[PDB]
Design a protein around this ligand. Structure first.
Ligand SMILES: Nc1ncnc2c1ncn2[C@@H]1O[C@H](COP(=O)(O)CP(=O)(O)OP(=O)(O)O)[C@@H](O)[C@H]1O
Ligand SMILES: Nc1nc2c(c(=O)[nH]1)N=C(CO)CN2
Ligand SMILES: [Cl-]
Ligand SMILES: [Mg+2]
Ligand SMILES: [Mg+2]
Length: 158
Protein backbone atom coordinates (compact mmCIF):
# COMPACT_ATOMS: atom_id res chain seq x y z
CA UNK A 1 0.00 0.00 0.00
CA UNK A 2 1.18 3.53 -0.75
CA UNK A 3 0.93 5.74 2.32
CA UNK A 4 1.33 9.49 1.92
CA UNK A 5 2.81 11.08 5.02
CA UNK A 6 3.00 14.80 5.80
CA UNK A 7 6.07 16.04 7.65
CA UNK A 8 6.19 19.21 9.71
CA UNK A 9 8.74 20.70 12.07
CA UNK A 10 9.30 24.13 13.61
CA UNK A 11 11.61 23.42 16.57
CA UNK A 12 15.18 22.22 17.15
CA UNK A 13 16.55 22.81 13.63
CA UNK A 14 13.68 21.77 11.35
CA UNK A 15 15.99 20.79 8.46
CA UNK A 16 17.88 18.33 10.67
CA UNK A 17 14.58 17.05 12.08
CA UNK A 18 13.14 16.42 8.62
CA UNK A 19 16.32 14.70 7.42
CA UNK A 20 16.32 12.50 10.51
CA UNK A 21 12.64 11.69 10.00
CA UNK A 22 13.23 10.65 6.39
CA UNK A 23 16.05 8.33 7.43
CA UNK A 24 13.87 6.83 10.17
CA UNK A 25 10.84 6.43 7.89
CA UNK A 26 12.96 4.39 5.48
CA UNK A 27 13.93 2.13 8.38
CA UNK A 28 10.34 1.22 9.27
CA UNK A 29 9.84 -2.55 8.90
CA UNK A 30 8.11 -3.90 5.78
CA UNK A 31 8.23 -0.42 4.29
CA UNK A 32 10.32 1.72 1.95
CA UNK A 33 10.33 5.30 0.71
CA UNK A 34 9.04 5.80 -2.84
CA UNK A 35 9.21 9.56 -3.36
CA UNK A 36 10.05 12.62 -1.29
CA UNK A 37 8.94 16.22 -1.91
CA UNK A 38 10.96 19.42 -1.72
CA UNK A 39 11.24 21.23 1.62
CA UNK A 40 9.01 24.29 2.13
CA UNK A 41 9.06 27.14 4.66
CA UNK A 42 5.54 27.95 5.78
CA UNK A 43 4.06 30.46 8.26
CA UNK A 44 2.36 28.84 11.24
CA UNK A 45 -1.28 27.86 11.10
CA UNK A 46 -2.75 28.69 14.49
CA UNK A 47 -0.92 30.56 17.26
CA UNK A 48 1.49 33.16 15.86
CA UNK A 49 3.94 32.96 18.76
CA UNK A 50 5.94 30.14 17.16
CA UNK A 51 8.54 29.73 14.41
CA UNK A 52 7.93 29.02 10.73
CA UNK A 53 7.54 25.36 9.76
CA UNK A 54 9.46 23.16 7.40
CA UNK A 55 6.79 21.15 5.58
CA UNK A 56 7.23 18.22 3.21
CA UNK A 57 5.51 15.03 2.06
CA UNK A 58 6.67 11.48 1.44
CA UNK A 59 5.22 8.43 -0.33
CA UNK A 60 5.97 5.25 1.64
CA UNK A 61 5.26 1.77 0.32
CA UNK A 62 4.26 -0.42 3.26
CA UNK A 63 2.84 -3.83 4.11
CA UNK A 64 2.04 -2.74 7.66
CA UNK A 65 -1.51 -2.31 8.89
CA UNK A 66 -2.38 1.40 9.22
CA UNK A 67 -2.38 1.45 13.04
CA UNK A 68 0.98 -0.33 13.07
CA UNK A 69 2.33 2.30 10.69
CA UNK A 70 0.95 4.89 13.14
CA UNK A 71 2.78 3.20 16.01
CA UNK A 72 5.98 3.59 14.00
CA UNK A 73 5.46 7.20 12.95
CA UNK A 74 4.62 8.09 16.55
CA UNK A 75 7.78 6.33 17.71
CA UNK A 76 9.83 8.46 15.30
CA UNK A 77 8.22 11.66 16.63
CA UNK A 78 9.12 10.63 20.17
CA UNK A 79 12.69 9.66 19.21
CA UNK A 80 13.02 13.18 17.82
CA UNK A 81 11.91 14.79 21.06
CA UNK A 82 8.25 15.56 20.29
CA UNK A 83 6.61 17.04 23.35
CA UNK A 84 2.86 17.66 23.30
CA UNK A 85 1.73 20.96 24.79
CA UNK A 86 -1.66 22.07 26.08
CA UNK A 87 -2.31 24.50 23.24
CA UNK A 88 -3.68 23.34 19.91
CA UNK A 89 -1.59 23.89 16.76
CA UNK A 90 1.50 24.65 18.88
CA UNK A 91 5.15 24.14 17.94
CA UNK A 92 6.79 20.73 17.68
CA UNK A 93 10.12 19.14 16.78
CA UNK A 94 8.47 16.63 14.46
CA UNK A 95 4.95 15.88 13.25
CA UNK A 96 4.19 12.90 11.01
CA UNK A 97 0.59 12.79 9.79
CA UNK A 98 -0.76 9.95 7.70
CA UNK A 99 -2.57 11.84 4.93
CA UNK A 100 -3.66 8.85 2.86
CA UNK A 101 -3.25 5.12 3.28
CA UNK A 102 -3.72 3.86 -0.26
CA UNK A 103 -7.33 4.54 -1.19
CA UNK A 104 -8.56 3.51 2.26
CA UNK A 105 -11.09 5.32 4.39
CA UNK A 106 -10.35 4.81 8.08
CA UNK A 107 -12.38 6.11 11.02
CA UNK A 108 -11.23 4.93 14.44
CA UNK A 109 -10.46 6.61 17.75
CA UNK A 110 -6.70 6.65 17.02
CA UNK A 111 -6.82 7.14 13.26
CA UNK A 112 -8.77 9.22 10.75
CA UNK A 113 -7.73 8.86 7.10
CA UNK A 114 -7.82 10.85 4.87
CA UNK A 115 -6.21 13.26 7.34
CA UNK A 116 -9.09 15.32 8.66
CA UNK A 117 -7.93 18.84 7.65
CA UNK A 118 -5.61 18.17 4.73
CA UNK A 119 -7.94 19.54 2.03
CA UNK A 120 -7.82 22.90 3.78
CA UNK A 121 -4.02 23.11 4.04
CA UNK A 122 -1.74 24.24 1.22
CA UNK A 123 1.21 23.14 3.36
CA UNK A 124 -0.09 19.58 3.04
CA UNK A 125 -1.58 19.65 -0.47
CA UNK A 126 1.25 21.38 -2.34
CA UNK A 127 4.04 18.99 -1.26
CA UNK A 128 1.65 16.09 -1.93
CA UNK A 129 0.89 17.45 -5.42
CA UNK A 130 4.63 17.64 -6.13
CA UNK A 131 4.99 13.88 -5.57
CA UNK A 132 1.55 12.66 -6.70
CA UNK A 133 0.13 15.03 -9.34
CA UNK A 134 -2.42 12.42 -10.56
CA UNK A 135 -3.69 11.59 -7.08
CA UNK A 136 -7.41 10.96 -6.64
CA UNK A 137 -8.91 10.94 -3.14
CA UNK A 138 -11.09 8.09 -1.84
CA UNK A 139 -14.17 10.33 -2.37
CA UNK A 140 -13.28 10.64 -6.05
CA UNK A 141 -11.92 14.20 -6.01
CA UNK A 142 -8.72 14.92 -7.92
CA UNK A 143 -5.94 16.59 -5.94
CA UNK A 144 -5.22 18.79 -8.96
CA UNK A 145 -8.82 20.05 -8.89
CA UNK A 146 -8.94 20.68 -5.14
CA UNK A 147 -5.89 22.88 -5.60
CA UNK A 148 -7.55 24.69 -8.50
CA UNK A 149 -10.74 25.33 -6.54
CA UNK A 150 -9.10 26.57 -3.36
CA UNK A 151 -6.33 28.57 -5.09
CA UNK A 152 -4.09 28.39 -2.04
CA UNK A 153 -0.95 30.53 -2.15
CA UNK A 154 2.03 28.66 -3.57
CA UNK A 155 4.77 27.74 -1.13
CA UNK A 156 8.34 29.01 -0.78
CA UNK A 157 11.28 26.61 -0.63
CA UNK A 158 12.97 26.19 2.75
N1 LIG B 1 -4.13 10.38 9.96
C1 LIG B 1 -3.50 10.55 11.14
N2 LIG B 1 -2.15 10.67 11.21
C2 LIG B 1 -1.60 10.84 12.42
N3 LIG B 1 -2.17 10.90 13.63
C3 LIG B 1 -3.50 10.78 13.53
C4 LIG B 1 -4.21 10.60 12.36
N4 LIG B 1 -5.58 10.49 12.59
C5 LIG B 1 -5.69 10.61 13.90
N5 LIG B 1 -4.48 10.79 14.52
C6 LIG B 1 -4.33 10.99 15.95
O1 LIG B 1 -3.94 12.34 16.19
C7 LIG B 1 -3.47 12.31 17.56
C8 LIG B 1 -2.80 13.62 17.88
O2 LIG B 1 -1.67 13.79 17.00
P1 LIG B 1 -0.94 15.21 16.99
O3 LIG B 1 0.23 14.97 16.10
O4 LIG B 1 -0.65 15.65 18.38
C9 LIG B 1 -2.09 16.36 16.21
P2 LIG B 1 -1.24 17.54 15.16
O5 LIG B 1 -0.70 16.81 13.95
O6 LIG B 1 -0.29 18.37 15.97
O7 LIG B 1 -2.42 18.49 14.64
P3 LIG B 1 -3.32 18.32 13.28
O8 LIG B 1 -3.92 16.94 13.30
O9 LIG B 1 -4.33 19.44 13.38
O10 LIG B 1 -2.42 18.51 12.09
C10 LIG B 1 -2.58 11.06 17.59
O11 LIG B 1 -2.34 10.53 18.86
C11 LIG B 1 -3.28 10.12 16.63
O12 LIG B 1 -3.94 9.06 17.36
N1 LIG C 1 2.60 26.00 8.64
C1 LIG C 1 2.19 24.97 9.44
N2 LIG C 1 1.40 25.23 10.46
C2 LIG C 1 0.96 24.25 11.24
C3 LIG C 1 1.34 22.92 11.00
C4 LIG C 1 2.19 22.66 9.91
O1 LIG C 1 2.56 21.52 9.66
N3 LIG C 1 2.60 23.70 9.15
N4 LIG C 1 0.84 21.91 11.79
C5 LIG C 1 0.18 22.17 12.87
C6 LIG C 1 -0.37 21.05 13.72
O2 LIG C 1 0.10 19.79 13.24
C7 LIG C 1 0.10 23.56 13.42
N5 LIG C 1 0.12 24.52 12.31
CL1 LIG D 1 -11.62 11.76 0.36
MG1 LIG E 1 0.26 14.96 13.96
MG1 LIG F 1 -0.33 17.81 12.02
Amino acid sequence: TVAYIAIGSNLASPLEQVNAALKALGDIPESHILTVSSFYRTPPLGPQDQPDYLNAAVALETSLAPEELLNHTQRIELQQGRVRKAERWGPRTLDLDIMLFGNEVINTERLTVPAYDMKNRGFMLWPLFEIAPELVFPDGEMLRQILHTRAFDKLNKW
